[PDB]
Amino acid sequence: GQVYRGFIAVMKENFGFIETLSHDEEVFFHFSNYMGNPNWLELGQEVEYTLALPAENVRMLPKNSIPQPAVLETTHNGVVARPLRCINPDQQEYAGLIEILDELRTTVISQHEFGITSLVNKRDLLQKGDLVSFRIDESGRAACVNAVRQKKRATVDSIKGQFGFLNFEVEDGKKLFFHMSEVQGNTVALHPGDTVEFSVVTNQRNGKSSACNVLKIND
């Protein structure tokens, strides 16, 4: 009967997780306890919930309902020291952590926690070692976090339903996997022999790489 507010952090097939107001923990909810159509829930969405502990009576709130700290002016470059727990559910800390380093890159100047509402692209796989460009808020947390990834180019080699492979080699001479959900813009269909621009992400838990932010560049 205890009522809280928070932000959608994870969405699975019939359940998800809500990031707490303080951005320091997550709460489970089953979709049968969401007061609406869960297909319309997006990551970052503001919600009100009641603890049963899992959450119940999860309710969508109007955008900008939940006050947040002011975001301070100017951007910074940082490095991710720890991911958000959503991508490593066994890690002790909930929040991710970004560090700003000194010029030798061997002393931490400042540290900034982040959560789902910190991220510009809430689907990006932000992991230890990733470079980010971001803002700091009045509470010291990271906001407006953008991943800074090197762009590569390659031809599409094959397409199998909702995924395919690029002529860009990773381990063992294997060709780089991509999922169609990463294809940017209003491209109706890629074909083998098209050229795409992309970044490479390697999942540090299972070692698998994929192409992200895939943009067709040939006419």
Added chain:
RNA sequence: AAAAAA
């Protein structure tokens, strides 16, 4: 083939 996580 389920409600705690490709």
